[PDB]
Each structure stands twice: as structure tokens, then as C-alpha cells.
């Protein structure tokens, strides 16, 4: 819980608990007992809804796909949906198992093949690569059930890189890849339908659990432009004769006059 | 007063604040419980751990800021650089010391921060990875040059807007990072101790830059009553508790 408020009478002190220093890079400890006359207040609120586990552990949407010919593919990443990508880009390193739930409006009999990294996925339905011996697969009938399965932390390091300030190839190389793109791939999910019944919309809800965030950061203050790319200059009109005009798309509203708001 | 002595070199200050200790941890060596390679790491401990003072920059009216990538800034600073090039991996904490002093007539402020994994944004438009030559400028630093529509777009130039931290996040929230402020009214230097912050025990000192030192002129530099319109800023970085492993040929060309 949060601490209670202590009483505070009139104080005439020579050590001001108000005059701090912003330059020292430390925040002030000034509680309202230092500025005014407080009363004892049994305060029992908790920030239990703010800890990383309950903050991120809510099973948001990570990606949508569309079964074209009873087949669709999705490479696991949080980079497509800005709302959850921002909550992740709060922190630098994150370590979490994830719990994938598939909300599909299809009807019939579907199959999900979690392709671990480094192998070839089925390039279409009724491919030979679907008969797999070791690639873990999930069968389900969308009516009567939502398929769900946990992927443990597949990291190749002690955490996930939300931001990576490095490359993967040495200096003189030519196809160097900035960012977190090479640092990790979580495989991919290949969906197919064995029947013909339902729609084609598949939503992948992923819930980070057993989270352990590592380095806080300034939350993203600009709308994204690409994935894995942390650009923010939006090039809105590529066709017209202004393509070289780059919007900014921030969220700082302006007020008409200071000292009047 | 203050005095910071690492091997072979001494830093002295007179109007200095309390030294910031990034995330409350001092730089330490790699414990056996956390190590993953088998080869025995090397410990220079007196020829690598010392204050290498990079070039001085010119703080003028209209300078937007400078950022130094680490450990890339020290890649040619003595035996620390020589070990960076001759070893497959390495980890090191740093002791970053910033120095700027003007007068009792000058005014202004600098927000001196230390960003882990400062993944820079592209200078704009199409999806293009920023060039290797630009996020690895060496000790010369990188002048920020400020935002504009006329900045060059070729070769993956990094972002030049200091308000958005050159990465898309607002300035002023940069204070969540281990930082300090050089207010020419009250202090004239800033010291920051940073441990090795990375999700892996050691990684290549050339491909990956863990930290990034960023100095932004939060408030411009007024000369006041004195004909001095610019002041040099000097950055004196010192590795500390550095260790490398996996010897090999020089990764130069």
C-alpha cells in the first residue's frame, strides 16, 4: 500500500526540505508534510494495478492475418500494433513468456503450425511441409473453443531487445541491419483451414507473463512509421509533388496563451 | 570539491555536484554465475581504466547538441581501443565526466544524459537502416544540426531533431535516464558513473554500442555583459572494470 500521511505542525526550520537541486539529477523527496499542515490520514490505496506484471499482462492484440486460400502466415512480433508496441517501448530489455490466443471467425477445422526459427514453413495450404514430425502444431475447431498455448522465453540472451543500438555484420559489410531485427526471431505461425466453412479473419492475442522489465525509457511520443525501425518522420503523400514533405505526428497540443490556461 | 582518480589520471573539480551513479550500481566484473564463454577474460586495469578526454566541442548560440556513442568513442583511445579491436567480446563500465565553465555573467543549461541502446531514427521517409558510418562516428562525436526539411536523406543519415531525442521520444522525459544538468549559474561540471548495462554478459565492442552520451543545450547560452559568445565543452570518459575475452586478429581492415 501507499504510506499514510503524517501530521505536521507549524515548522520554523533552518534546513529547507523544499529548496532542492534539479541539476544533481535526483528527484525531490518533498511530501506534503514539508510544505503545509497535514493531518494523519489512514491511506490504503495500492499501486497494484501499476506493477509491470499487471500493467503489461493483459493479452493485447499483436497481429491480424487473412486466410487467402485457406492459408495465412504471421511472423511473431509486437511491432505492428502501435498501442502495445508503445507499452513495450517503455522499457529497454524485457523477459517474458507469452501466451498466444487465436480469435478466428472461421468455421471448420483449422491448424496452426508454430515454425521454430531456421526451417522452411509451408508456403501454401495442402503443402507437403504441413505433415511435420517435430514442428509443434495446434488443431482446433473454432466453434467451441479458442486455441491457446504458451511459448516460453526463447531469447538467445537474458532478455528481449526492445531497442538495439547495433548492427549484426562488421563495418565494411553491405546489408547491415540496424535495430533489433536480427537480434531475435520468435518463429512464425502458419494458419490453414481444412474445411471451407467460415471467414478469413484471424486475430492473435498475446499475453506477456512472468515479465521482468529492465531499463525504463521515455515513452514513445510520436506515431510510428515502420516496424523494427523507430523512425517517426511520416512521409504522407508519396504520389503527389510533395513526397519530400515529412509530417511529424506528435501529440503535443498547443494552448493560445500561457498564464491563461 | 571533488577528486576522482583512476589509474594514471586524476580529475579535479571545484563547483561540482553529487556524482550520479546510474541505477545505483557500481561497475563490477563478470561473476562466474553470470558468464557464458569459457575463455579467461583479460583485465588491463590500469592502461584501459583511465580518463580519455575526447575532443572539445563549441557551445554557441544555436548549437542543438552532440551525441557520442560508447564504447565507439574510445575505439582509438590507447590500449582500450587496442583491446576493443583485438578481442571478440568485451564489457566495461564507464565514468563519464562533462566539463563546461563560462562565468558569472553567462547563462544557460545542458541536459547531460546517458541513454542505453539509443537506437537512432532515420533522417526521414522510406524505411532505411541508418548507416554504419554515422552511428559510429568515433571520438569526434556528432553535432546534431537541428531539425529541418533540408537535411540530407542519403546513406541512412540519423535523425537530427534534438527535441525528439533523435529517436522519436520527447526530450524532457530524457530525465528517466541517468542524467545531470550543467547550469552555468550553479555548477560547471557533471560526473556520471554507468555500469555495464546490457542483457548479455559480453558482446562485440564494435558492432554494438551499449551507451550513448547525449548533451543537449536545454537553454541557450547568453553572453551577458561579456564579449564571449561561445564556451568549449569537454567530455572526459574513463572505462572502469573493463574486461575483454576471445582474443583474435585485429578487427580493422
Amino acid at each position: 500500500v501507499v504510506p499514510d500521511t503524517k501530521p505536521s505542525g507549524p515548522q520554523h526550520t533552518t534546513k529547507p526540505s523544499i529548496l532542492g537541486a534539479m541539476e544533481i539529477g535526483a528527484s525531490s523527496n518533498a511530501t506534503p508534510e514539508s510544505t503545509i499542515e497535514t493531518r494523519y490520514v489512514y491511506n490504503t490505496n495500492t499501486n497494484a494495478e501499476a506493477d509491470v506484471e499487471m500493467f503489461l499482462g493483459r493479452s493485447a492484440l499483436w497481429g491480424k492475418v487473412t486466410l487467402t486460400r485457406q492459408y495465412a502466415k504471421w511472423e511473431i512480433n509486437f511491432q505492428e500494433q502501435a498501442h502495445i508496441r508503445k507499452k513495450f517501448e517503455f522499457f529497454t530489455y524485457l523477459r517474458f513468456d507469452m501466451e498466444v490466443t487465436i480469435v478466428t471467425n472461421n468455421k471448420g477445422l483449422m491448424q496452426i503450425m508454430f515454425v521454430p526459427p531456421g526451417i522452411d514453413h509451408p508456403e501454401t495450404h495442402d503443402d507437403r511441409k504441413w505433415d511435420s514430425a517435430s514442428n509443434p502444431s495446434v488443431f482446433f475447431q473454432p466453434k467451441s473453443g479458442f486455441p491457446r498455448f504458451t511459448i516460453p522465453f526463447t531469447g538467445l540472451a537474458s532478455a528481449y531487445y526492445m531497442f538495439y543500438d547495433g548492427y549484426d555484420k562488421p563495418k565494411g559489410s553491405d546489408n547491415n541491419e540496424y535495430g533489433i531485427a536480427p537480434t531475435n526471431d520468435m518463429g512464425l505461425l502458419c494458419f490453414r483451414t481444412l474445411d471451407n466453412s467460415g471467414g478469413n479473419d484471424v486475430k492473435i492475442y498475446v499475453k506477456p507473463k512472468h515479465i521482468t522489465a529492465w531499463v525504463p525509457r521515455p515513452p514513445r511520443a510520436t506515431q510510428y512509421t515502420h516496424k523494427y525501425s523507430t523512425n517517426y518522420h511520416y512521409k504522407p503523400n508519396s504520389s503527389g509533388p510533395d513526397e519530400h514533405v515529412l509530417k511529424d505526428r506528435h501529440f503535443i497540443k498547443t494552448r493560445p496563451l500561457i498564464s491563461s490556461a | 570539491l571533488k577528486q576522482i582518480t583512476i589509474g594514471n589520471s586524476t580529475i579535479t573539480t571545484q563547483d561540482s555536484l553529487h556524482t550520479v551513479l546510474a541505477y545505483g550500481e557500481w561497475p563490477t566484473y563478470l561473476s562466474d554465475i553470470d558468464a557464458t564463454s569459457v575463455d579467461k577474460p583479460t583485465h588491463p586495469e590500469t592502461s584501459a581504466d583511465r580518463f580519455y578526454t575526447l575532443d572539445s566541442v563549441e557551445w554557441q548560440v544555436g548549437s542543438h547538441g552532440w551525441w557520442w556513442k560508447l564504447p565507439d568513442a574510445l575505439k582509438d583511445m590507447g590500449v582500450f581501443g587496442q583491446n576493443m579491436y583485438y578481442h571478440s567480446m568485451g564489457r566495461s563500465g564507464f565514468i563519464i565526466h562533462t566539463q563546461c565553465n563560462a562565468t558569472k555573467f553567462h547563462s544557460g543549461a545542458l541536459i547531460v544524459a546517458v541513454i542505453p541502446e539509443h537506437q537512432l531514427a532515420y533522417v526521414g521517409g522510406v524505411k532505411v537502416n541508418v548507416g554504419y558510418d554515422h552511428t559510429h562516428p568515433g571520438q569526434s562525436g556528432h553535432q546534431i544540426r537541428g531539425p529541418s526539411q533540408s537535411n540530407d536523406r542519403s546513406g541512412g543519415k540519423p535523425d537530427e531533431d534534438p527535441l525528439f531525442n533523435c529517436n522519436g521520444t520527447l526530450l524532457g522525459n530524457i530525465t528517466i535516464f541517468p542524467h545531470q544538468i550543467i547550469n552555468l549559474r550553479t555548477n560547471n561540471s557533471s560526473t556520471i558513473v554507468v555500469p555495464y548495462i546490457n542483457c548479455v554478459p559480453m558482446d562485440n565492442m564494435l558492432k554494438h554500442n551499449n551507451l550513448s552520451l547525449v548533451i543537449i543545450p536545454l537553454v541557450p547560452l547568453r553572453p551577458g555583459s561579456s564579449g564571449i559568445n561561445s564556451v568549449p565543452i569537454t567530455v572526459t570518459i574513463a572505462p572502469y572494470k573493463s574486461e575483454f575475452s576471445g582474443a583474435m586478429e585485429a578487427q580493422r581492415q
Partner: peptide, 25 residues
């Protein structure tokens, strides 16, 4: 507190601010 899948990664959700706000020596 039962774990029905006999595995750690299958469990549900699991459970000092001075590292920031005071990172001084």
C-alpha cells in the same frame, strides 16, 4: 495454488524506487 500442467512456464500471472529518483553516490 495448483499448477495443472506440471510446468513453470504454464503458470498464471506472477507477482525500491531509489534506483531512479536518487542515483547518487
Amino acid at each position: 495454488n495448483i499448477n495443472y500442467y506440471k510446468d513453470s512456464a504454464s503458470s498464471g500471472l506472477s507477482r525500491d524506487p531509489s534506483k531512479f529518483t536518487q542515483p547518487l553516490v
